[PDB]
């Protein structure tokens, strides 16, 4: 009447993505961990743009839209800052936000390429992905135009908007050989073999298994550049644990109140 002891094994650890395997766990836990990877991951991003003079050809809102999608590294800052909604002050305080500034004006004859490098941040560690590969092109200016503005960044998660979606794409896959028959191939010979498939090239799919549970769930969390993949996994698990704890506390209070 208790849970299980899952095991973890990393197959490839890089600075762009991680391929780990979780064994001895239920499918629901795996799928929830995936959906938390995509939606419920704290991360800093641009959410408040004050435009003072925009003489470019694009719309006034286009600049803000593009600035909202520029990733910001938050390896050790997202855990420190607090949600702006729960702040106990007025104006975007640096304790709960990060300020940005952009002032570019094409003076020379050639056209300018306003990139993310022009975003001069007040904080040293909260900068766009340019540390260590070209930079995210914001807009193109021509002689006579200008773009002056300043924006503030805050913490959010993908459930609110896609700007806070650190993972590019999670490759979730379990049971490479169709052993549990969760999908029925009309013509198994016509399908290619999964990357993680242990069967030989002769047989098309593994035989049926009545008493068999889904295990050995594969992951390919791919970081966009803001948060490290293992950092994404740790943050997501910590957030799920916090949500579970809050739910338990609320349930306990409701029971005692009755």
């Amino acid at each position: 009447p208790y849970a299980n002891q899952p095991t973890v094994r990393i197959t490839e650890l890089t600075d762009e993505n991680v391929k780990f395997i979780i064994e001895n766990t239920d499918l629901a836990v795996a799928n929830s961990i995936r959906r938390v990877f995509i939606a419920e991951v704290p991360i800093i991003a641009i959410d408040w743009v004050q435009i003072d003079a925009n003489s470019s050809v694009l719309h006034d809102e286009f600049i803000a839209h593009r600035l909202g999608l520029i990733p910001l590294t938050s390896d050790d800052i997202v855990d420190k800052l607090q949600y702006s909604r729960d702040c106990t002050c007025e104006e975007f305080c640096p304790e709960c936000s990060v300020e940005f500034t952009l002032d570019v004006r094409c003076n020379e004859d050639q056209t300018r390429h306003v990139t993310s490098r022009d975003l001069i941040s007040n904080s040293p560690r909260v900068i766009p992905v340019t540390s260590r590969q070209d930079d995210i092109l914001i807009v193109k200016l021509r002689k006579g135009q200008e773009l002056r503005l300043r924006a503030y960044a805050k913490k959010g998660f993908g459930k609110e908007h896609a700007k806070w979606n650190p993972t590019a794409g999670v490759a979730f896959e379990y049971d490479p050989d169709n052993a549990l028959r969760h999908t029925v191939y009309p013509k198994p010979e016509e399908w290619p073999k999964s990357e993680y498939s242990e069967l030989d090239e002769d047989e098309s799919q593994a035989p049926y298994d009545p008493n068999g549970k889904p295990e050995r769930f594969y992951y390919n969390v791919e970081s966009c550049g803001s948060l490290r993949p293992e950092t994404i996994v740790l943050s997501a698990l910590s957030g799920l644990k916090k949500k579970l704890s809050d739910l338990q506390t609320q349930l306990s209070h409701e029971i005692q109140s009755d």
């Binding site: 208790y2 002891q5 899952p6 973890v8 740790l234 698990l237 644990k241 338990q248």
Partner: peptide
Amino acid sequence: ITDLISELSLLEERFR
């Protein structure tokens, strides 16, 4: 809820 929390914490520790 309690034992799911325990399993998640153990999974965290093993992954780390």
